Each structure stands twice: as structure tokens, then as C-alpha cells.
């Protein structure tokens, strides 16, 4: 699996609901080895998300500096584990939002490889 393809599996849902995160965290394999605690899905075209790597260069939350913030806010869905969630029985709360996405980009072609934050 390439880094770019892993970002698409974990974070892109361009074609698309309070069960959404429970359905999607399982279908994208994010409950397989552990309950991935927080994960965001983006409901914008893949072209529009890839274009963020040409938008505003900002620091990543860990201090790396190859992150990029979208000039427009985007339709996103935050998936966050519930208080009862415990692996192997993962459970998620779904929250829809409209926020600027921040991604780390790598490669040539230069594309998103990590979803960092929304602001």
C-alpha cells in the first residue's frame, strides 16, 4: 500500500448520519488491529484535497513543517471513540464539521500522506 493510497483509504470519502463513523471505521480497516482513536473523513473531491498540498504551508501539530492548510473550509466528519469503546469492540461518535483541513504532504507528485488536524 503506498502512503498516498493509505491516506485515501483512511481519510477520503468524496461520494458522501450518526452511525457513519461506526460503519466507516470498520470498512476502512481502522478497527482491525486496534481501535484507531480519532480519524477524520473528508467529503470533498480527491482533486480538491490533493490541491491542499499547494495551499498554505503551516506547522504540523508534532512540529514538522511539511503541513498544508486548506484556504477554504471543507465538509468533514470527525470520528472519535466513545467512552465505552474498548478493542475488540470499537465504538465511535460521529460529528460533522466544516473546517480548514491540515495535511502533511510528501512525494513526487506531492500529495497528502497524513491527516493532521482541522481548524
Amino acid at each position, epitope marked *: 500500500e503506498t502512503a498516498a493510497a493509505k491516506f485515501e483509504r483512511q481519510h477520503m470519502d468524496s461520494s458522501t448520519s450518526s452511525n457513519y463513523c461506526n460503519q466507516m471505521m470498520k470498512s476502512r480497516n481502522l478497527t482491525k488491529d486496534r481501535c484507531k482513536p480519532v480519524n477524520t473523513f473528508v467529503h470533498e473531491s480527491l482533486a480538491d484535497v490533493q490541491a491542499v498540498c499547494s495551499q498554505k504551508n503551516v506547522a504540523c501539530k508534532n512540529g*514538522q*513543517t*511539511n503541513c*498544508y492548510q486548506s484556504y477554504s473550509t471543507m465538509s468533514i466528519t470527525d470520528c472519535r471513540e466513545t467512552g465505552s469503546s474498548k478493542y475488540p469492540n470499537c465504538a465511535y461518535k460521529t460529528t460533522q464539521a466544516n473546517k480548514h483541513i491540515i495535511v502533511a504532504c510528501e*512525494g513526487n507528485p*506531492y500529495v497528502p500522506v497524513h491527516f493532521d488536524a482541522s481548524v
Partner: nanobody
Amino acid sequence: GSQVQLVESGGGLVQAGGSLRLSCAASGYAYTYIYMGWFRQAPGKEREGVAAMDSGGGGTLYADSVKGRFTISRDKGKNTVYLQMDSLKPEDTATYYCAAGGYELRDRTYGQWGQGTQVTVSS
């Protein structure tokens, strides 16, 4: 100026022991690139990071082979990065590339690249 362009100048042919400066100025990007740097690809070798510096003039990193001979600076213009190269050695012969928007000397993290400027150090 719809396209980002990393304009490279300086470099070229020089005798061993001599000096050159490489200059890079980005145009077409409205904000500040946090990291800029210089990479090179020498004959027979993979591309490597040579020097990089953050927009505050800090986070400065050099390839071990050039520490104490090359000096990177960003104090000469917004999104500009310069490399003073002293005491040049034949093994510094390479295509040098300006890069912007990445992290430290990690090539895969940079998304904007100059076209490449030849530096040739003769004996």
C-alpha cells in the same frame, strides 16, 4: 505569476579550492515557506540534502560533508535562500536544487523544487 517558480542562479564551473554562491528566490507563493533548502545530486549518487534553514533563520542543518565550508542564509528577501560555498572540492560537483515547503533535509517532504543548477568543481 500564476505558477510558483523557484528561480535558481549562481553556481557553475569553478576550480577546486574556489568559491561559489547559489541563490534561490521563490515567486508566485503569497505566504512564507517555513523551510527552504538546497539539495544536490552528484554523479554516481542519490540526491541528498545539503543545507536547510527555517524562515526565522534557525533550524539550520547541513550535510556532514559540507559543515564548516558552506553557509546557508535566508536573511536576503522573503522566500529566498542562499548557499555560500567555500573551499569547494571535486566531490561537490553535482546538480544543486532549491526546495521549499518541506522539513529539515528530508527530500520527500519538499513539494516545490527548482529545475537544478549545475556546479562543477575541476582539479
